[PDB]
User: Fold A-type flavoprotein from Giardia intestinalis.
Amino acid sequence: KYVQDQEMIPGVYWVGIVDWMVRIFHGYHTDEGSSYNSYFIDDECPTVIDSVKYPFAEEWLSRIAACCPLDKIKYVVMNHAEGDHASSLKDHYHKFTNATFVCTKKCQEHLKILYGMEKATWLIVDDKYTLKIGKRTLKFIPVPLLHWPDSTFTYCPEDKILFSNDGFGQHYATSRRWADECDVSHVMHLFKEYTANILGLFSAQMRKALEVASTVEIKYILSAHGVSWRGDAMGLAIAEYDRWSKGQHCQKKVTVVLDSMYGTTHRMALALLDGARSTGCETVLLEMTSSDITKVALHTYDSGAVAFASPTLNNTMMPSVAAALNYVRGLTLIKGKPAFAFGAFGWSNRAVPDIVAELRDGCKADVYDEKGITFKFNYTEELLEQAYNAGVDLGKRAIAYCEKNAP
Amino acid sequence: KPKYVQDQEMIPGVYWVGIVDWMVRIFHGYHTDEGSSYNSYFIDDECPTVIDSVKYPFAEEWLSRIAACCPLDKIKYVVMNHAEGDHASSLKDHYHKFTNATFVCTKKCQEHLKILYGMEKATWLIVDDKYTLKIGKRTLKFIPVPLLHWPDSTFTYCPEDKILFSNDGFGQHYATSRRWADECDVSHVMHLFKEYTANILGLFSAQMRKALEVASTVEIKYILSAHGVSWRGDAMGLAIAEYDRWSKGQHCQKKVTVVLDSMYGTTHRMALALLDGARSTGCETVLLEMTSSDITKVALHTYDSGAVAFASPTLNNTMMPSVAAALNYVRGLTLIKGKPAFAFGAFGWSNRAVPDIVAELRDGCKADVYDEKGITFKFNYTEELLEQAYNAGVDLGKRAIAYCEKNAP
Amino acid sequence: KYVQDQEMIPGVYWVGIVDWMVRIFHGYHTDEGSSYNSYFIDDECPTVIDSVKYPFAEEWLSRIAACCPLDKIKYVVMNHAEGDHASSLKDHYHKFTNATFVCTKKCQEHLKILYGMEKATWLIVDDKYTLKIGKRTLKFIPVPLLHWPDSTFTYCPEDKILFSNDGFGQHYATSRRWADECDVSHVMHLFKEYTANILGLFSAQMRKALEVASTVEIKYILSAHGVSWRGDAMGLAIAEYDRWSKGQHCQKKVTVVLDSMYGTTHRMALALLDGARSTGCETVLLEMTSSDITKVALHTYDSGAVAFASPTLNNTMMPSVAAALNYVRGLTLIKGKPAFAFGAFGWSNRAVPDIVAELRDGCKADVYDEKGITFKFNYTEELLEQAYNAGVDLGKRAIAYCEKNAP
Amino acid sequence: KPKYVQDQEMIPGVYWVGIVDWMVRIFHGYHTDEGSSYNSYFIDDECPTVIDSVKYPFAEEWLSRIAACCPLDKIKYVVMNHAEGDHASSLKDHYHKFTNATFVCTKKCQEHLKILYGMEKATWLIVDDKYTLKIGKRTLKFIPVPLLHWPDSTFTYCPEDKILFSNDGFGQHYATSRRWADECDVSHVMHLFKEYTANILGLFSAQMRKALEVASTVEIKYILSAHGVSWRGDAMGLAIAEYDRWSKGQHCQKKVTVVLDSMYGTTHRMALALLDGARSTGCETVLLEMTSSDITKVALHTYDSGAVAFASPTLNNTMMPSVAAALNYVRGLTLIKGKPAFAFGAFGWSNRAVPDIVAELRDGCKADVYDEKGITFKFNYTEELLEQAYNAGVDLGKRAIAYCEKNAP
Ligand SMILES: Cc1cc2nc3c(=O)[nH]c(=O)nc-3n(C[C@H](O)[C@H](O)[C@H](O)COP(=O)(O)O)c2cc1C
Ligand SMILES: Cc1cc2nc3c(=O)[nH]c(=O)nc-3n(C[C@H](O)[C@H](O)[C@H](O)COP(=O)(O)O)c2cc1C
Ligand SMILES: Cc1cc2nc3c(=O)[nH]c(=O)nc-3n(C[C@H](O)[C@H](O)[C@H](O)COP(=O)(O)O)c2cc1C
Ligand SMILES: Cc1cc2nc3c(=O)[nH]c(=O)nc-3n(C[C@H](O)[C@H](O)[C@H](O)COP(=O)(O)O)c2cc1C
Assistant:
């Protein structure tokens, strides 16, 4: 015995791993690590839900074996073929001598392409298939493009458990298995960060999945990342997804994202920020030299209005701002939102036009003022006052936006 | 005068005129992952008064905020609680701008301000713990808190408005547009409040006991700190309660933290087995590996652990440099003094890291090093070794629970 | 005495500062720090050439004072108004009680806007003005947009010194003042990095400035960054600028720039790399998770061909690759060069089309194969062979490009 | 079989089948700013032979390169010089793929390979310094180099082709498509060759003396290393000459390095004055501040300095944790043993960092701590203090020059 068995509810065990050390994960800055949660269901047909990424294969296998001999597992349910939940299967899928791998057709296709699994036995399920595992039954809820074509939730009607896989997840390494055992506001913070960064462009798919969830009874949501959900905290998590899925998740908040070389665009950004704050909005300033794209997604996600700024560098915007806009564009996080642009230049104003074009045509933001504010080389008190006034207007627009899109 | 700052009246006649340091990430070696702020306050009274200054890069912003409230030549008093650069260094170049002001501080603070910053032509008013400064409707009192955390450290108290200007006290390195804890997630503010305590104040519990004793003697409705958000109502009660428990050594949790570094991951795998053992007792368990952590987080977690473990493979006849740094830091801050502490690690040919860690835990940190052998092994772990690690963790977890029971609030 | 006087040639003293600690400088990764070199000319009219960035004002003033009382300086020549050479003047320009600030009209304009300097005495020079300073005279060579509109070189005909300011510079912190006292190949390395990152888009302006330099005699080039140049090493530095200015600076070299989340685009990149290597080219692989835009500029600068790769992330390329392309585009470093693109996708191939468009229309590279190589989810031996073959073709194209554009 | 690797014949019948690790940036705590490679070699002879393996993540690439030269079932010998994971860990999962191979190594290497990696069904041939392995036209000899840098470390020598397969020996953490030093900037390769020596081998000069003695007895035309580029001709002469000087303690330069950390920059400014003093003597001077440097660079520079200084302000009654790490690392590597060493630093109320640095330099590093007082000051420097620092630097520079003269090659 060198693992602790962790029964979370009667007959359902956490057999995942905590990734204490991960700091960059597919470009997400996981400042608090993550976990790859897998579950063991102690029933007539002993069942494993999901796997883990491949450096942790032996730890995963050890926790399963502590519950049930690997050769007595009957079913391994795979919700999603992504490596963080999957990749252990490439070299380890055989240790489940007598198991059937249970998944949808699209999941089975991706698993084979990724990891091979040439000798595996399959059971291909769908949204009408009911799988008897003894006392319990399992249903399968395809959630295509939430966030992959193969994404699935597994639902146990008897215990009222949703195995939501990436759904309801947070990149959060902890020894606690439930949200309510932590600071719930901290878990909700990471839950929103996960939503912004991974799910941002899939609000429509979320509406569909929440609609399905609303037709069944759920007392527990066991996610594949971070902590799991029950009772009141579970209510909060569901409500946040619900508002987000309807575009009702924004706050009276302005975020300014920028980079700067000699600090003048930064000083203007501070004056604009005070203007926005004067309207009663929360204001956040994110400078790419001290921030990252993961935080840009987090804050733009629930901002009522945004500003992006850069001085002109080599006839365009700074690369860090190009990265941030690419990321926000891909994730659709500012679509329809008031968006302002400003920046210094030395001889030819190019960054601001480029930012404006990207916000308007790329992000489909509400670029209400295409001129923005530009200045040659240095600010002055009058320019600071102009930035402040633009901030007042931006904060007013954020408040009006939130009212228009209110929950 | 063009308007480019928002006036921020926090309570009647008291304005925030500080700055938010959005970008700072390393601050005297503190990993300020969430930035900080240098809070300064303007009191609108018959003698217009400024409390504290800010770090020199932000001087013009600070002066701009003050001038929006009152012309600089009409400021009568600038009260300085602390001479450290983050609240003071703008005075070097800029103090002359307060044409008519007198700088008000204790003798120790004046000595330090002059050595650091010059202020050769400044007008001073030297105060002590018996001085009442009249500023109009309000008066101000001064509470020296020496070595909380500098010899010059002071609090300023206003009896009429029940305000404690606590300077570094009650601070958190937290950049936000919010001025009050209750406007934020209070649990998040408390997390950073604890990180600040662990990293800046850790060795000063006796001085905190003294300071809390004095504060207990007067009514406080507001604590306006010089870093991060300020305190009122219920949230203020929480902040005070944490300092009180910590000053008495009653701040610990049923929690085990393992701090380590590893080169090929075998010391890491043994750490995981130990952690599960500890978790089985009902303790929270945190693993901090120095390649993905930092000394600021080491201080945070060791602060409120009931027990700790430190681990390293042998590298060149000693422990890994990252673990030496973590131990230096923890020793200086006294965070694990008296606490159950365990050590383990791999070696190739000569076991040196674990003996060196044990000696440092026992003689440097003055931890409760109950097992001076620890667990060592050559090159690789086995299932038997993982089991031994797990069992050592169970015992460590039990010792953490015992330590907390003995020191309970 | 707490500074060492550093006479570099008779009557000419280094009075700059070494910035040992700087690691990020206007977005340039200065892994080896930098220096802001200023010079004191001991003549009848004691003269200072350039200033320094503003945290180092007192150290600069101290080294000058060690040579000559600050109130006995007659001239302060300013080549360039950028903060790294300038910004000390804002709060310190007055310490030169009896000095005249000598610069071109555009330099004077930028200095005032930046730093104020309201009480300063000016002498506005131009490309025909000769300034007597005693034994020596100074001439002024405007080098507009090398790299700023105000950029200037100062030339002393008697001593045959070119004070080239940013010209001939390298971000290199050392106690050595001359290239030949270091490892010259190391200095040339940083010299090329500086060229790629700061001067990349100004080859035309470099041809003009080298033409002017070719009309006068230069024994020493005293730069404002890093080490200075004489004799043989000086010949190397001049020759590299000359080739670069004519587009003759490329090597038989292929650089592949990419990011990857799960490593399949990375494995394909390795096979492509071996294909290019087989043709006799040097091959460099730069992965954005372990590289930076400064290194991307360095390597694309002298590559004969390039490849950019990314899997599809949220219907576009990864943000780090968007940043790299923005930067390379701004700097014009791959204009006209063979350029290939490839990458994995899960369901909709978008990164490769976006990379192709950016390379073709943005960078104006020679995108000879717009399809590139794309694959769903995972490589296979046949796909690796396809990547290898594309690499052979890319390396052949790099060699043909170098031959076409040969020195 | 699809073709997706280039065969890379380095010399007649000897092929590079290693991997270039383009992305590695931290390697067992070494800051590998330029990546590395794990070089393995295939010898085309009557008994097809592989020298060394690679780190497990790169196993399939390594096997692909080998298979392009020879089917895996036709490999007769796999020679293992060293059991460390970077050259060996692919064997854990993959060793069975060499169906017909015998693993050839010393007894110590076999013991370590089995403990690390299992290899339960492997066929072994245990060799020693008197064994000649016939592989066809060629024979192979084995040169144990214990503690250069592991107990199992070995070189393999081919007498017919005059090849030394030196494994970690002569290595550099350098990722490049070039296989030979002379195809690169040789000065750059030598820089990294020195960084490798300083960081990996620093404490093993005696073992290097032994190894060079043995190598001197045979003719070597090629040194094929397991990291970075390999050596031939003139460049090979340079590499050998550096190891020779270093093994004899003759590797130092007229060079002073100052290693420090600072919180508010006054210790930093004094460092600059000291550095100018040192520079005035004709020494090169390098300043390394831990917030912008790393222990790998500290090792690099202290390696070939004739004198050093270490500095820190007092933080919580001791030196800054970053400086404790740098000293731990330097102590373990023995890089400043016998070298003139100076200490200085600011303090606020109680001078603790400088005494702690002096004790560590003197008793831990066994440096020549000629002035145990150093320079300390409260809070801030003055022109007089800068002058004192400058003078201490002049003296340190003179002592560096003297140390180099005494130890000259
Ligand atoms: C390396 C560098 C490149 C620049 N390239 C351009 C350019 O292409 N066009 C332009 O108008 N200004 C250019 N500038 C001028 C900047 O836009 C100008 O310095 C501005 O004031 C910087 O704003 P900031 O203080 O926010 O960094 C450049 C400046 C630097 C330092
Ligand atoms: C560069 C390096 C230096 C080492 N130095 C020592 C040493 O001085 N003494 C020792 O007993 N083992 C030494 N070792 C062996 C390690 O302690 C051994 O590899 C251990 O198993 C590593 O533990 P880990 O897997 O947790 O990294 C060294 C290993 C490396 C990689
Ligand atoms: C967070 C994430 C988002 C993705 N978004 C898309 C997408 O928008 N379109 C697509 O075709 N594939 C998408 N993919 C699939 C990747 O392109 C696919 O996993 C690919 O194989 C990764 O290549 P790599 O191994 O080089 O990282 C996404 C994958 C992840 C992990
Ligand atoms: C957080 C912190 C902790 C300190 N702890 C001590 C201490 O334990 N003893 C002491 O004498 N000075 C202490 N000091 C004072 C510093 O040593 C003093 O500020 C010194 O001038 C800093 O040097 P520097 O400018 O090189 O950073 C401390 C300062 C700070 C900022």
User: Anything to note?
Assistant: DSSP finds twelve helices and 24 strands in chain C. Chain C touches chain B through one residue (CB under 8 Å).
